């Protein structure tokens, strides 16, 4: 295959699986605000810990201050692609 899709495809699933897995040696199956900020930076540019921490505490208040793969997979799946570039 000449073309490739790193979004809403198997490539995205594996990419994120290893991304969170490698950044989760504690084996918690989740990532804290700080951890999420590191992986999120790859999707955006380079935000501040205080900024990301505020979004995590506001986006994750009905659960906790951690991130679950299911949440990221659901959001990326509902968006259809999220990023265009
Ligand atoms: Ca962890
Ligand atoms: Ca949550």
From TrEMBL:
<dbReference type="GO" id="GO:0005737">
    <property type="term" value="C:cytoplasm"/>
</dbReference>
<keyword id="KW-0106">Calcium</keyword>
<dbReference type="GO" id="GO:0030234">
    <property type="term" value="F:enzyme regulator activity"/>
</dbReference>
<keyword id="KW-0505">Motor protein</keyword>
<feature type="domain" description="EF-hand">
    <location>
        <begin position="11"/>
        <end position="46"/>
    </location>
</feature>
<keyword id="KW-0518">Myosin</keyword>
<dbReference type="GO" id="GO:0046872">
    <property type="term" value="F:metal ion binding"/>
</dbReference>
<dbReference type="GO" id="GO:0016459">
    <property type="term" value="C:myosin complex"/>
</dbReference>
<dbReference type="GO" id="GO:0000226">
    <property type="term" value="P:microtubule cytoskeleton organization"/>
</dbReference>
<dbReference type="GO" id="GO:0005509">
    <property type="term" value="F:calcium ion binding"/>
</dbReference>
<keyword id="KW-0677">Repeat</keyword>
<protein>
    <submittedName>
        <fullName>Calmodulin, putative</fullName>
    </submittedName>
</protein>
<feature type="domain" description="EF-hand">
    <location>
        <begin position="47"/>
        <end position="82"/>
    </location>
</feature>
């Amino acid at each position: 295959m000449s073309e490739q899709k790193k979004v809403l495809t198997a490539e995205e699933q594996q990419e994120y699986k290893e991304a969170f897995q490698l950044f989760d040696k504690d084996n918690d199956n989740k990532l804290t605000a700080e951890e999420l900020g590191t992986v999120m930076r790859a999707l955006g540019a380079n935000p501040t810990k205080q900024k990301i921490s505020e979004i995590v505490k506001d986006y994750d208040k009905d659960n906790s201050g951690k991130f679950d793969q299911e949440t990221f997979l659901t959001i990326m799946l509902e968006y259809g692609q999220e990023v265009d570039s």
